Amino acid sequence: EQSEALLAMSTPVTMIWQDILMLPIVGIIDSKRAQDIMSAVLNKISENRAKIFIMDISGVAVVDTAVANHFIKITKATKLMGCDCLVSGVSPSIARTMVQLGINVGEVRTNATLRDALENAFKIV
Amino acid sequence: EQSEALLAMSTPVTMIWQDILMLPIVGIIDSKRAQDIMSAVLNKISENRAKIFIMDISGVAVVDTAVANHFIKITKATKLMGCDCLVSGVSPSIARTMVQLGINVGEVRTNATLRDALENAFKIV
Amino acid sequence: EQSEALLAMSTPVTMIWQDILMLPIVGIIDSKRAQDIMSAVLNKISENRAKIFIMDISGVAVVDTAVANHFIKITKATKLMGCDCLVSGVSPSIARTMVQLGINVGEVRTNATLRDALENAFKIV
Amino acid sequence: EQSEALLAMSTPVTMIWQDILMLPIVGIIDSKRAQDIMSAVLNKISENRAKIFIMDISGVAVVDTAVANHFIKITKATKLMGCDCLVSGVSPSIARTMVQLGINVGEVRTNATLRDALENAFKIV
Amino acid sequence: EQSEALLAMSTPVTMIWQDILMLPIVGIIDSKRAQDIMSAVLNKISENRAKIFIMDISGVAVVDTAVANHFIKITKATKLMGCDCLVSGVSPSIARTMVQLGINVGEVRTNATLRDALENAFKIV
Amino acid sequence: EQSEALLAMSTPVTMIWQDILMLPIVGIIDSKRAQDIMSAVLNKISENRAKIFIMDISGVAVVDTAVANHFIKITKATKLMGCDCLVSGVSPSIARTMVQLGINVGEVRTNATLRDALENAFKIV
Amino acid sequence: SAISISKLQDVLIASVQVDLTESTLRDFSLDLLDAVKSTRAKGVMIELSGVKTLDGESMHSLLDVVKTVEVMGRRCLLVGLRPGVVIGLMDIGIDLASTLCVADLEQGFLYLE
Amino acid sequence: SAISISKLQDVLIASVQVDLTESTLRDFSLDLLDAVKSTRAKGVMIELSGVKTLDGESMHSLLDVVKTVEVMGRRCLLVGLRPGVVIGLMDIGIDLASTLCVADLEQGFLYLE
């Protein structure tokens, strides 16, 4: 039930008024579950095509190694769908652990909390 | 961990840009956990006093009997704080099960999905 | 108790919104009680200095002989306090009994009921 | 004579310029006399139909138990005549004794002294 | 010394900026001293001819019988110079004692405290 | 009686239209009486809080040594209440006797007679 | 007695420093407020619950209700200890909606009046 | 401890309920105010002397002075018990003119800021 309870969590964290989309989630999570989320975003996008979407990781529960991978690959996939993705919320040591990985590819759009994210969206709007 | 993972879920489902607040959650949930959520809303309200807040139950997982009780007492609770609380998302048979309970007290404000809720909020805004 | 009940009557019949003042009372009344009223007006005037004040005798209960005397002396005293006094309400045979007394001194301001009195006051206002 | 002197008191405490009406009275009073006042208001209302009327109890002489009853029933009757009734003046412990009665029904209009009452009336005017 | 201290009091209670004049004094006072004040006003008037002057008796210390006489004759006197004299401050029972004297001649100008007196003066100004 | 006659003098020499205040007095006076005046000003200030007040010493009767002390401490005192106090009237040799005392602290506001004092006040007004 | 309260404009400023175990002090405050109402005659009234260590005084809730009604005057509450205050308050329930959290515990409804 | 104080806008509202015999409580209040200054960072500060049963605390006057100066912030006093407060206050004398009787003990300098 807790799995399905987990699955219950992602779809709301995607939907928002005015076709804006986003995706807050827990940081220490299963990789296969992340692939699930990957599948969820694709179907969600079909459900309502949205150029607007974001990755929210506010307070990521744990900065797992493969977890970056997901958002590494995930960020790329979402934006390049033609469906933009942004990081609005996150932890800093989470970020350090990331930068310390020597990560170099990232050059996407991000924001400060769901506050600056919406401001930008209502501006892309 | 899944508990704390649950606790991880409620605080984001409360916070929103522009001091607007809301609270989406799973419908079949523990009553003690709901009291936890009760406590969470109080502290959240202190954290940032917000006249704006909503109860979101979109797709309530299960229409549990005591669960109404929570939102019965809870809905009264936002107004008790002096805060506003609205129901933006929910299931219909969930509602029928409720009305069938012969529920009669409810006379609060609600909305259609997070769409009409924000519209109203940006109007109360 | 009825005395104090009487005393209860005069102070309200003096006070009015916007510092306007007046004094309706029963026509057949005790002379000593009238001196009391005399004392009441003085203190009332101190309480709130008012240039506006009126003597109301609408439907004077009985046109007593000494009773004129009071309002004779009273009218003079009140106006000359620098605190004007006007007669807004009264009976006609009451008046005849007065004129029949051969009364001659009166040359003060009066009005028709509390209606024309206020109109004038809101004009002196 | 003092009775009729009492009866002398209520009708003036009802009449006012511009068809406004009100009713100041002594707080410790006879219940049958209050029924008299009840009768007086009805006839007064016929005499000049007035949507404007008020109950004034400034400095109620004594907060008698049945006396509430009168104004309980009285307030209801007057307003529902289609002839509004307001409380402009009163004592506070008088009020406490009332609230302490656990009174719960009252939800009518009131005012601060004959000052805020007229202001409102000249606004309903 | 207290006499001369008394004499010290009247001349200031006469002088005022802008040639306005007035005369506050204690109510229970010596008649000969009042004649002194009479003399003082004459000289004061010469000193600076003033059409503006007032009799102030605020809180007259005691409503002495001969004391009226003074202000009776005295009031007539300002007019006699052609000077103006007004009563701005006084007590009410003081006034009653006066009216009770059956006083009838007074028909001069008066005011409410030094407030309405100046207002009038700045209007005669 | 002359004492109370003295006490009669100070309160009027304090009160003025438009909440302006001042205090003319005799120069050779008792020190304890001056403390009385001190007490009078405090109560007077409560009676009507006034930021405006003045010390008038026109024609001070005698430049007594301790008398300065009073106005020394007294002047400081208006400022101590936060009240304003000004010297509008005074004698010159009175002043010389003062300056000759080698007085040095004074740096407060003053005026020429009750004329320039009011002008300033109507400007602070 | 130590308790005291002052008002800005026609706006009263009642203040809950702590849960007043004394409902007698509750009565005392009620008396003070009625006295104030009689003298001041001003309309706005406010109350700040910094904390209510004790809750469930239906009588205190009643005091709150009478204070709105007799005053026939404005009435707002700064919610304190809500987590433990409100759950008890919610257990009590409420039949009124006149007052609410003071928008800024002062600044909000001062502005509002 | 019973003593507590709250602020509207950036305006502090210190309140003298009674003469605080405890200069230690004076120290306590000083501490609270400095703590408040550090956290709130707001500028306006006010103090209401409803009464000062005891006067001549040069140390308390000093407390008043430090409170204006360290705050580098606004500072006003509602004069209470002046007749007996001021004479003692006048016996003490003063070397400053920054503060004054609060214009409306709140409404006056609230407006003023």
Backbone angles phi and psi of E23, in degrees to 5: -155, 70
With contact defined as 3+ CB pairs under 8 Å, the chains touching A are: B
Say whether F5 and E3 touch across the interface (CB within 8 A). no
Say whether F8 and E26 touch across the interface (CB within 8 A). yes
Distance from CA of B92 to the nearest CA of G (A): 27
Structure token pair of residue A111 = 């924001």
Tell me the sheet residues that pair with A56: A24
Q: SS3 for G47?
A: strand
Structure token pair of residue D65 = 């138990």
Interface contacts E/F by beta carbons within 8 Å: 50
* Mutate which: F80, F84, F107, vs H, most H CBs within 10 A: F80
Amino acid letter for position G2:
A
Q: Please enumerate in sequence order all residues whose Cβ is within 8 A of that of F64, keeping only pairs 6 or more positions apart, or say none.
A: F27, F28, F29
User: Which of F1, F9, F16 is nearest residue E9 as measured by Cβ atoms?
Assistant: F9
Instruction: Write the DSSP string, chain A.
Output: -HHHHHHHHHHHHHB-GGG-B--B--SS--HHHHHHHHHHHHHHHHHT--S---BB-TT-S---HHHHHHHHHHHHHHHHTT----B----HHHHHHHHHTT-------B-SHHHHHHHHHHHH-
Among the listed residues C62, E58, B100, G75, the one whose alpha carbon sits nearest the alpha carbon of residue F15:
E58
- Measured CA to CA, the distance from residue G1 to residue G22 in angstroms comes to 12
Say whether B81 and G103 touch across the interface (CB within 8 A). no
Chain C residues with CB-CB distance to E98 below 8 A: 77
Are B19 and B52 spatial neighbours (Cβ–Cβ below 8 Å)? yes
Chain F residues with CB-CB distance to H77 below 8 A: 82
Chain D residues with CB-CB distance to G69 below 8 A: 95, 99, 106
Among the listed residues D15, D24, D35, the one whose alpha carbon sits nearest the alpha carbon of residue D60:
D24
D97 CB within 8 Å of a chain G CB: no
∠ at Cα E14 (E10, E20), nearest 5°? 175
Instruction: Write the DSSP string, G6-24.
Output: --BTTB--EEE-S----HH
Among the listed residues C75, C110, C118, C67, the one whose alpha carbon sits nearest the alpha carbon of residue C90:
C110
Neighbours of A44 (CB within 10 A): 20
With contact defined as 3+ CB pairs under 8 Å, the chains touching D are: C, G
G23 CA to centre of own chain = 14
* Mutate which: F4, F7, F15, F17, vs E, most E CBs within 10 A: F17
Tell me, letter by letter, the H, E, C secondary structure of F24-87. ECCCCCCHHHHHHHHHHHHHHHHHCCCCCCCEECCCCCCCCHHHHHHHHHHHHHHHHHCCCCCE
Structure token pair of residue D112 = 């601060």
DSSP H or E run through F90: none
User: What stretches of D30-105 adopt beta strand conformation (E)?
Assistant: none
- Measured CA to CA, the distance from residue A92 to residue A57 in angstroms comes to 11
Q: Please enumerate in sequence order all residues whose Cβ is within 8 A of that of F91, keeping only pairs 6 or more positions apart, or say none.
A: F27, F57, F58, F59, F60, F63
Chain B residues with CB-CB distance to A1 below 8 A: 28
R_g over Cα of chain G: 13
C43 CB within 8 Å of a chain E CB: yes
* Mutate which: C35, C71, C80, C108, vs E, most E CBs within 10 A: C80
Q: SS3 for G101?
A: strand
- What one-character DSSP code corresponds to residue H15? E
**Resolution, expressed in angstroms to one decimal:** 8.3
User: Which of E2, E17, E114 is nearest residue F2 as measured by Cβ atoms?
Assistant: E2
∠ at Cα F59 (F58, F65), nearest 5°? 100
Q: Which residue of B has its CA nearest to A5?
A: B26
User: Which of C42, C74, C83 is nearest residue E93 as measured by Cβ atoms?
Assistant: C42
Distance from CA of B117 to the nearest CA of G (A): 21
G112 CB within 8 Å of a chain H CB: no
Q: Which residue of H has its CA nearest to F43?
A: H83
Distance from CA of G82 to the nearest CA of B (A): 6
C-alpha separations of E50 from A59, E20, E46, E58, E79 in Å = 86, 7, 8, 22, 12
